């Protein structure tokens, strides 16, 4: 059901949110990462994000809780609704296009260590119509 590689990739996502590396995601850490990803959620919006996943109730998300939600979302969310949500993270100004500059910001934000050239290559590979940027449909074709 879950290989070690899938588990470590789910840990890579968990680690981004648990910035102090103590095995727990707090609101403060959830708030910090969500703001770096363009968003700006409400203080209530952060405690019920934490809440919907914190299954034992200690007010915090450990990796077993996280791995349980990710395994369920992987089985429940449809493949198209999946990417739409990711696109909206990339398309930081909501104009319907992911530019190289927008992709660069997410790459640096998620601690990736890519060259400006490599990001350009990433855009090149998904750009199907040649306008130098990535729309929603182009994103789904690469992501699947």
């Amino acid at each position: 059901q879950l290989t070690e590689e899938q588990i470590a990739e789910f840990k890579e996502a968990f680690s981004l949110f648990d910035k102090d590396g103590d095995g727990t995601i707090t609101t403060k850490e959830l708030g910090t990462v969500m703001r770096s990803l363009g968003q700006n959620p409400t203080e209530a919006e952060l405690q019920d994000m934490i809440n919907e996943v914190d299954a034992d109730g200690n007010g915090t998300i450990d990796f077993p809780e996280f791995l349980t939600m990710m395994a369920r979302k992987m089985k429940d969310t449809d493949s198209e609704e999946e990417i739409r949500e990711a696109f909206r993270v990339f398309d930081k100004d909501g104009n319907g296009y992911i530019s190289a500059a927008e992709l660069r910001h997410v790459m640096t934000n998620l601690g990736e260590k890519l060259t400006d050239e490599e990001v350009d290559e990433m855009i090149r590979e998904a750009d199907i119509d040649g306008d130098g940027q990535v729309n929603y449909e182009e994103l789904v074709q690469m992501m699947t």
Binding site: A13, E52, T77, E82, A86, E118, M143
Partner: peptide, 19 residues
């Protein structure tokens, strides 16, 4: 939600790096 979208994005970067 926002947790799974983040996984999807890190996978996109992963897939590219293998090329």
């Amino acid at each position: 939600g926002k947790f799974y979208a983040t996984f999807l994005i890190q996978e996109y970067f992963r897939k590219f790096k293998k090329r």
